[PDB]
Amino acid sequence: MVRKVFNDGDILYAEDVNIIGQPFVDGQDLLGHGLKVDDNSLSDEPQNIKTRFYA
Amino acid sequence: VRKVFNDGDILYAEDVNIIGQPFVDGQDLLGHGLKVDDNSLSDEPQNIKTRFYAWYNRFRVTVQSGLTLSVTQGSISVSGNIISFPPQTINAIDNANSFVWIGKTDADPAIALRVSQTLPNVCIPLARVIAASGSVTSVTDLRDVSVDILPPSIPDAVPVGS
Amino acid sequence: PAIALRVSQTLPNVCIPLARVIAASGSVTSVTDLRDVSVDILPPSIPDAVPVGSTIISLIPPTAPIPAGYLELLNSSQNVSRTTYSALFVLWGTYYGNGDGSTTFGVP
Amino acid sequence: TIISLIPPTAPIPAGYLELLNSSQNVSRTTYSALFVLWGTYYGNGDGSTTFGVP
């Protein structure tokens, strides 16, 4: 999102689409790297690590 | 997810900026994908997944088939000596409320996985299995990391003057 | 008696085990984690009381009261209730007499 | 030493060594707390692996 921001007349290049195609959750500043994963982002399913660890 | 595109729609810069920032949280929005399950977590070692489950699922007893129960791999410490066990199987005692544990008997010094009808005083309890008619009706986890085993009462000392 | 981090040759019966280290030529070949996160400790034994059915000899005068949790051996066999002394009845049976044969058993 | 009247069919209490008619030789390492206390005083079953039992 940061270091690559689009505007109304901006061309959409194939490299940008390929980058967005691989989402990253490392919290980095790049185009496809969204944000880190907190406890909420983990699934609230009883069979998952969050529920077991909190139990 | 929330906003849906179709033929004839015009892509907007804000749409790409939203899409460019993925959020994994299960929220129903354009860029918010879904909630992270165990599979989405990295499976190679030196990661919280395998680290957590190698301790959580240690010597866990499950009904493999019929009276045959599966015990996951693990390790035990006997006076500082580490003895490792691969995943093994053992047959429950039929028509009984038996106990699956790890230890030894008076007639056998080898430390191994055993099924009895009464928990020995010195053992590592694993499960209480209720089985009937060649089938395992229920399994109750005894080595659970959430259940806490209270220690036994202080032994009655020899009476003074005796 | 001070509680601290100690490197010994054999783990004491009561302690918090941390690791086992194998050292050769002034170098550490291996360190094995003895904590709960890696291993499950098997107790060598439990602290136990005097076993049921064992006999202890005492010098206490007759005026002193009978110790709790014990039965007194008399000049003749006794008939003791099986329900009250279920532990002793289990460990002994009727090997010292059948008592009535239904609800009591004999004590030598 | 604990004296008991339990019948032969009754199991030996755990953590106890039965004393039979003759002497025995039990492993020093298996019974370490016993060997450090008694010592080689009731016999030397072997050189450095077992010790005697009256």
Closest-CA residue in chain B for D14?
B106
* Contact residues, B window 116-135, toward D, CB-based 8 Å cutoff: 121-122
Count of pairs with CB atoms under 8 A, one residue in B, one in D:
5
DSSP state of B45: S
Is A5 at the interface with chain B, CB within 8 A?
Answer: yes
**Resolution, in Å, please?**
3.9
CB atoms within 10 A of CB A55: 9
What is the distance, to the nearest Å, from the Cα of residue B31 to the centroid of all Cα atoms in its chain? 35
Nearest to B77 among C41, C48, C50 (CB): C41
Phi-psi region of D50 (alpha: psi -120 to 50; beta: other; left: phi over 0): beta
β pairing state of B81-85 and B88-91: unpaired
- For C64-91, letters b (16+ CB in 10 Å) and e give eeebeeeeeeeeeebebebeebeebbeb
First to last CA, chain A: 36
Nearest to C39 among B76, B156, B158 (CB): B76
Nearest to B161 among C44, C45, C60 (CB): C60
CB atoms within 10 A of CB A21: 8
Helices (H), chain C: 86-92
**Both structure tokens of C26:** 């002034």
Is A22 at the interface with chain B, CB within 8 A?
Answer: no
How close B156 gets to chain A, by Cα (Å)? 37
Range list of β-strands (E), chain B: 61-65, 68-71, 74-78, 81-85, 88-91, 96-105, 108-116, 124-132, 135-141
**Both structure tokens of C91:** 């460990």
* Record: contact C53-D10, CB cut-off 8 A: yes
Q: What values do phi and psi take at C45, rounded to 5?
A: -165, 165
* Record: contact D4-C53, CB cut-off 8 A: yes
Integer CA distances (angstroms), D4 to B19, B92, C75, C83, D10, in order:
82, 36, 18, 22, 11
B36: exposed, middle or buried (Cβ count in 10 Å: 0-12, 13-18, 19+): buried
β pairing state of D24-27 and B68-71: unpaired
Determination technique for this PDB entry?
cryo-EM
Contacts 24+ apart (CB under 8 A), B43-52: B48/A49, B49/A49, B52/A49, B52/A52, B52/A53
* Record: contact B122-D14, CB cut-off 8 A: yes
For residues C57 and B161, what is the distance between their CA atoms, to the nearest angstrom?
10
